[PDB]
Ligand binder design. Sequence first.
Ligand SMILES: Cc1cc2nc3c(=O)[nH]c(=O)nc-3n(C[C@H](O)[C@H](O)[C@H](O)COP(=O)(O)OP(=O)(O)OC[C@H]3O[C@@H](n4cnc5c(N)ncnc54)[C@H](O)[C@@H]3O)c2cc1C
Ligand SMILES: Cc1cc2nc3c(=O)[nH]c(=O)nc-3n(C[C@H](O)[C@H](O)[C@H](O)COP(=O)(O)OP(=O)(O)OC[C@H]3O[C@@H](n4cnc5c(N)ncnc54)[C@H](O)[C@@H]3O)c2cc1C
Ligand SMILES: COc1cccc2c1C(=O)c1c(O)c3c(c(O)c1C2=O)C[C@@](O)(C(=O)CO)C[C@@H]3O[C@H]1C[C@H](N)[C@H](O)[C@H](C)O1
Ligand SMILES: COc1cccc2c1C(=O)c1c(O)c3c(c(O)c1C2=O)C[C@@](O)(C(=O)CO)C[C@@H]3O[C@H]1C[C@H](N)[C@H](O)[C@H](C)O1
Ligand SMILES: [Zn+2]
Ligand SMILES: [Zn+2]
Lengths: 230, 230
Amino acid sequence: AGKKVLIVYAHQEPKSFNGSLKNVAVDELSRQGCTVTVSDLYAMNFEPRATDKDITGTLSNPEVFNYGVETHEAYKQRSLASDITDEQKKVREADLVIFQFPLYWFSVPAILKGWMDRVLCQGFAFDIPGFYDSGLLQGKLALLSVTTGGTAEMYTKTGVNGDSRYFLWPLQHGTLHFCGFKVLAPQISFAPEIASEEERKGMVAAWSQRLQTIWKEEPIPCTAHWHFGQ
Amino acid sequence: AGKKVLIVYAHQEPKSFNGSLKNVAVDELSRQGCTVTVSDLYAMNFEPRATDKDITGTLSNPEVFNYGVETHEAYKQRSLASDITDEQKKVREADLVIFQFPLYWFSVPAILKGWMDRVLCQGFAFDIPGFYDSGLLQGKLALLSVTTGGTAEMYTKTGVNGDSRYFLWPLQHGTLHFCGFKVLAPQISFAPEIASEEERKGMVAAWSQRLQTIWKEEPIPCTAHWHFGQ
Ligand SMILES: Cc1cc2nc3c(=O)[nH]c(=O)nc-3n(C[C@H](O)[C@H](O)[C@H](O)COP(=O)(O)OP(=O)(O)OC[C@H]3O[C@@H](n4cnc5c(N)ncnc54)[C@H](O)[C@@H]3O)c2cc1C
Ligand SMILES: Cc1cc2nc3c(=O)[nH]c(=O)nc-3n(C[C@H](O)[C@H](O)[C@H](O)COP(=O)(O)OP(=O)(O)OC[C@H]3O[C@@H](n4cnc5c(N)ncnc54)[C@H](O)[C@@H]3O)c2cc1C
Ligand SMILES: COc1cccc2c1C(=O)c1c(O)c3c(c(O)c1C2=O)C[C@@](O)(C(=O)CO)C[C@@H]3O[C@H]1C[C@H](N)[C@H](O)[C@H](C)O1
Ligand SMILES: COc1cccc2c1C(=O)c1c(O)c3c(c(O)c1C2=O)C[C@@](O)(C(=O)CO)C[C@@H]3O[C@H]1C[C@H](N)[C@H](O)[C@H](C)O1
Ligand SMILES: [Zn+2]
Ligand SMILES: [Zn+2]
């Protein structure tokens, strides 16, 4: 069990709850002897915008810019911007990719959305054909570790926000599964801002605890039924 | 009449199918006598990252940075960065906000995600109280005009991508409904890229044609049931 983990981390403040979850991941995975890398997006001033700056070569059509076409061709030619290919190396080497982030509008913060848009390009993360179970990152695991303002009860079928799993669909299925990841069950730390000090440490320790045995876990069945029920 | 429309547009290429949909909207709504404003995020090099540059002057806590709180206060205290307040003014004035974008990872392109993250701050778009039915943008309509790479066949309950309504939930319900918008039926232009000019013109025309009677429309019931039910 010599494993490589990439944590893609998206919080502005090292002393945040997200920051603590990120750090206990690094501590506990390091302790196990795993190889660990963190992409700290805000600290890298990570570029989120999909633009023609992401290709440095001769464009396939320089008069009508098609991001998807130009990045696919640029990946094959190796003329992608280097901040993109630096992240791809990290992914390629990883056995597990953990995403650590606060929920922003039922989704990831824009800086991490940009990571997904720019890094997971055609040719690297998927092809046509070559997606979902035939996606190019098959054999890798991914895991969303999410924090929320709202409560667990708010994130139920009958609660105001609907079930937590509803908002996971575009990320777990439309992105990770599409790229061929197997998806481990999400870690959702609900409403730490509201929680007591003891409840906070508890949530942190539950994460650290889960990580002790993460390599023994099976992935979820990443299906409409899992996310939405019958 | 005197209706005000903001189009928030997220495409790199003026000649794109998205560009054409935005321009038809400008043309037809202008023709009707509406007041029309376009936020061209890519042309504006719109900042998507939520950072402490979003607050001008001195922060409520320069030691430990909490984006939500710092921007809550800054809105209340009129100290938000001008790119944000410029956008908020456009929204405040609008009766209808149309979002025009290609689908990126079952969601909006990161640059548009950044607009939602940074522009729809606490105190402007929502508060305790005032969310969902009572959110601070009540009285306004919102409409998502999405283009996809995938076919309508794939975006069904049993198709590989699941029902298009599944990916609408975080946008329509978690974001737009949450802020008080009444949400018009989405405009989904499926797989323009592989369609014939005959079918493309048809999609553009349905859009122009739909815009003729947009102000007569009923909002969808923006419910978990509308999105996931039978
Ligand atoms: C733009 C935006 C959009 C948002 N959209 C949504 C949304 O759609 N849905 C939703 O539910 N929420 C939403 N939120 C709220 C957001 O998800 C939460 O504020 C976020 O998840 C909280 O995590 P945090 O790291 O920022 O918390 P923090 O405020 O950093 O943490 C809470 C407390 O934990 C303490 N702490 C830190 N380390 C430890 C430690 N190791 N042990 C114990 N305590 C510790 C911190 O000091 C802090 O007091 C949004 C917020 C923003 C800004
Ligand atoms: C990072 C990334 C992530 C993506 N994720 C997804 C995803 O999760 N799911 C998914 O389904 N797809 C996804 N896509 C694909 C994407 O949604 C489609 O490529 C996009 O919607 C195509 O729209 P467009 O405006 O760019 O098309 P274009 O290529 O610009 O347009 C299609 C054709 O219509 C022509 N046209 C333009 N104007 C007119 C007109 N007025 N009348 C007639 N014809 C006209 C254009 O010239 C062009 O030839 C992703 C793409 C990228 C780059
Ligand atoms: C755009 O963000 C959202 C979008 C959709 C839903 C939501 C949110 C959201 O931000 C959010 C919250 O921030 C919070 C909650 C929440 O449900 C949501 C959403 O559902 C739960 C909460 O309000 C309580 O439990 C109150 O007792 C605490 C928390 O607020 C935090 C953040 C601020 N510091 C706030 O002033 C208060 C002190 O606690
Ligand atoms: C990260 O993007 C995605 C994420 C999840 C699902 C999807 C996509 C996606 O991009 C996507 C597509 O781009 C395309 C399709 C699609 O289903 C998806 C997703 O489901 C359908 C398509 O392949 C055909 O209908 C061909 O007959 C055309 C189209 O391909 C685009 C790009 C190809 N390189 C080629 O240029 C083709 C003409 O258009
Ligand atoms: Zn899946
Ligand atoms: Zn709703």
